[PDB]
Amino acid sequence: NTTGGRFVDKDNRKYYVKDDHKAIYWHKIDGKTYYFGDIGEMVVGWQYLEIPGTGYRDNLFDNQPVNEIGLQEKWYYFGQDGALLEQTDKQVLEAKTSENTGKVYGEQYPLSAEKRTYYFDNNYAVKTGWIYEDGNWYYLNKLGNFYNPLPIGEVAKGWTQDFHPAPWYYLDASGKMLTDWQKVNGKWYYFGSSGSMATGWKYVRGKWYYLDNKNGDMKTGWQYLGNKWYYLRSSGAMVTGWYQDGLTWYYLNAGNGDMKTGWFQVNGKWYYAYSSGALAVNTTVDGYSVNYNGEWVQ
Numbered sequence: 640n641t642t643g644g645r646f647v648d649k650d651n652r653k654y655y656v657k658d659d660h661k662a663i664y665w666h667k668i669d670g671k672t673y674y675f676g677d678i679g680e681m682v683v684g685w686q687y688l689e690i691p692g693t694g695y696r697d698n699l700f701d702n703q704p705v706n707e708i709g710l711q712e713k714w715y716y717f718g719q720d721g722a723l724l725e726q727t728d729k730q731v732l733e734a735k736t737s738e739n740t741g742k743v744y745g746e747q748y749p750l751s752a753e754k755r756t757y758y759f760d761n762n763y764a765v766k767t768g769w770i771y772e773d774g775n776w777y778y779l780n781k782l783g784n785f786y787n788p789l790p791i792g793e794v795a796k797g798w799t800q801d802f803h804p805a806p807w808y809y810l811d812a813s814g815k816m817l818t819d820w821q822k823v824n825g826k827w828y829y830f831g832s833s834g835s836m837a838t839g840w841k842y843v844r845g846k847w848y849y850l851d852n853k854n855g856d857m858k859t860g861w862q863y864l865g866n867k868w869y870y871l872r873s874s875g876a877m878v879t880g881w882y883q884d885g886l887t888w889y890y891l892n893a894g895n896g897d898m899k900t901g902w903f904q905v906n907g908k909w910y911y912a913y914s915s916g917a918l919a920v921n922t923t924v925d926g927y928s929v930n931y932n933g934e935w936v937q
């Protein structure tokens with residue numbers, strides 16, 4: 640809704656001048672959208688800018704006061720003629736890098752040789768968060784790595800937290816979200832149906848597995864958890880019943896799986912495990928005899 644002015648080439652910059660004042664920030668001119676920053680220099684290419692449409696950064700000229708309101712910022716793409724790319728779906732564009740953002744008309748820089756697919760929201764900003772395409776989920780970065788906004792809107796690869804104990808996801812080499820059991824850096828992780836990395840005890844397909852409570856990696860062998868011992872086989876699955884480690888027998892509780900100590904009964908017969916879990920065999924324990932199977936013979 641800006642009219643009556645004209646574009647001007649001056650001082651190796653581009654301005655829009657109306658009645659001898661310069662356009663600043665966002666303007667809708669002649670069916671296209673432009674942005675002229677804080678002093679009037681028309682921008683081109685990739686730009687991380689305050690969002691348009693509020694009025695506070697819109698239809699303003701440099702003779703007018705500017706509200707000190709700090710608006711939210713997003714990525715936008717402008718053509719080399721300054722016109723905003725008004726995309727609401729997706730488009731393959733030169734990759735944004737450290738060398739091709741925040742430039743104004745007149746500044747010399749090369750377009751990126753590498754092109755990437757960028758996704759856009761209904762208001763022409765680069766989209767972030769989860770998107771679905773061709774049978775897969777991809778995550779578009781919401782934040783910079785851990786201030787610089789460059790990563791925002793890029794396709795996440797590898798281990799990625801989704802911030803609103805934020806959930807972990809793993810995206811493969813093309814960005815596809817993995818589900819179910821996956822081996823990453825030599826260790827097993829379970830991502831279920833939703834993609835969220837499991838932690839703690841998890842019942843999957845009729846067996847118990849323990850994933851590290853913080854890191855998600857599947858444990859095997861003997862594990863001391865919640866003041867009790869459990870034995871997990873090499874596949875990760877929790878064992879119940881009798882288990883022989885070398886010559887030594889252990890009994891893992893039916894159901895819960897915790898290792899028994901002291902006197903315990905299995906199918907009518909009595910057994911004694913020392914504090915280590917080791918079954919007493921062919922000896923006595925406090926007056927009671929136990930045979931080669933560890934059974935109490937009265």
Ligand SMILES: C[N+](C)(C)CCO
Pocket residue numbers: 769776816833834
């Ligand atoms: C990965 N999903 C989009 C299915 C859920 C994340 O909120």
Ligand SMILES: C[N+](C)(C)CCO
Pocket residue numbers: 798807836853854855
């Ligand atoms: C990235 N992991 C989820 C594997 C560990 C971080 O604590």
Ligand SMILES: C[N+](C)(C)CCO
Pocket residue numbers: 820827857874875
């Ligand atoms: C070995 N896991 C059971 C952890 C995954 C393969 O099914």
Ligand SMILES: C[N+](C)(C)CCO
Pocket residue numbers: 840847877894895896
């Ligand atoms: C039964 N487990 C102890 C293995 C899981 C939590 O109930």
Ligand SMILES: C[N+](C)(C)CCO
Pocket residue numbers: 902909927935
């Ligand atoms: C079963 N015993 C009698 C051997 C000991 C526990 O009461």
Ligand SMILES: C[N+](C)(C)CCO
Pocket residue numbers: 861868898915916
């Ligand atoms: C860990 N336990 C004490 C249960 C057995 C020794 O490996």
Ligand SMILES: C[N+](C)(C)CCO
Pocket residue numbers: 881888918931932933
């Ligand atoms: C002989 N035990 C009772 C110790 C184990 C049989 O599975």
